Amino acid sequence: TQGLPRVIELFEARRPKAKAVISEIDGVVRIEEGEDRLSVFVESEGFSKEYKLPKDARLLVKDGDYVEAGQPLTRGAIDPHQLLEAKGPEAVERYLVDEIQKVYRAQGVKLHDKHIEIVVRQMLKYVEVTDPGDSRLLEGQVLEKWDVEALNERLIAEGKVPVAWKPLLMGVTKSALSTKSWLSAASFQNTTHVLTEAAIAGKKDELIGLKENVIL
């Protein structure tokens, strides 16, 4: 069994060692290789692309199979960010939770999904900015889901063009270190690094979290 290292590999959203290719779009599956390298094409109506695969790795798909986005071509674990950019956040949450619970239940430990789910929501709670429009934001900037959500909400009422963005998934470490409260990250780790950017931005803790209050 993959055990605890798998659980950490999930909670940290790390790249799987077994990492399996997934269809970026919904095409038809076309298996093509002369004997050198194994290639698998997935082609929609006007689009197309292929996936370079080692001959040894066993796939799950048959030639002429109509597939969808995020659907795995090869067996093994799937890179969380890949299906984040393929299917969407929902399917992500589903996969993460189901895998963590997979390991746990396999070890014979029963727990309610809610626990895992909170953490999972904490993971993708950040987004990346693309074409900020009428907002002070810049391309590539990263900020919480709720923040940009409200920004767009008010931007619509102002008549101004909202902010296009993309969901951003990250591990518990990189998540917690990215939190609004600077006291939280300072308490956590990367202290020397955190306090620098904190002081530079002159960020101001509202004592929303309980741990930054534990300090106080």
Partner DNA sequence: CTTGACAAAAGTGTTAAATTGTGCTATACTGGGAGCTGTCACGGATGC
Partner DNA sequence: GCATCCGTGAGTCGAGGGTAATAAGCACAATTTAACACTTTTGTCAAG
Q: Which parts of this chain interact with DNA (CB under 7 A)?
A: 9, 12, 14, 171, 174, 189-193
Site residues, another protein (CB under 8 A): 138-141, 182-183, 186-187, 191-193, 195-207, 210-211, 214-216
Q: Which does 174 bind (CB under 5 to 8 A by kind): another protein, DNA, none?
A: DNA
Min dist. Cβ of residue 191 to DNA (A): 5
Strand-pairing partners, residue 74, are 59
Measured from the CB atom, the residue of 51 and 188 that comes closer to another protein is: 188
Q: How far is the CB of 216 from another protein (least distance, A)?
A: 6
Please give the Cα distance from 115 to 97 (Å, whole number). Answer: 10
Burial class (CB in 10 A: 0-12, 13-18, 19+), 187: middle
Closer residue to DNA (CB): 133 or 171: 171
Cα torsion through 63, 65, 68, 74, rounded to 10: -40
Return the one option of another protein, DNA, none that residue 199 interacts with (CB less than 5 to 8 A, by type). Answer: another protein
Cβ count near 3 (within 10 Å): 10
C-alpha distances (whole Å) from 12 to each of 20, 62, 96, 133, 206 are 18, 33, 11, 32, 27
Tokens of 57: 């790795």
CB of 124 to DNA, least distance (A): 16
Say how far apart CA 82 and CA 123 lie, in whole Å.
Answer: 15
Question: Residue 210 binds what, of DNA, another protein, none (CB under 5 to 8 Å, by partner type)?
Answer: another protein
For another protein, the closer of residues 23 and 181 by Cβ is 181
Query: From the list DNA, another protein, none, which binds 214 (C-beta under 5 to 8 Å, kind-based)?
Result: another protein
25 versus 172: smaller Cβ distance to DNA: 172
Is the distance from CB of 78 to CB of 64 less than 8 angstroms?
no
Taking the least distance from each CB to DNA, the nearer of 25 and 177 is 177
Q: Which does 62 bind (CB under 5 to 8 A by kind): another protein, DNA, none?
A: none
d(CA 184, CA 178): 9
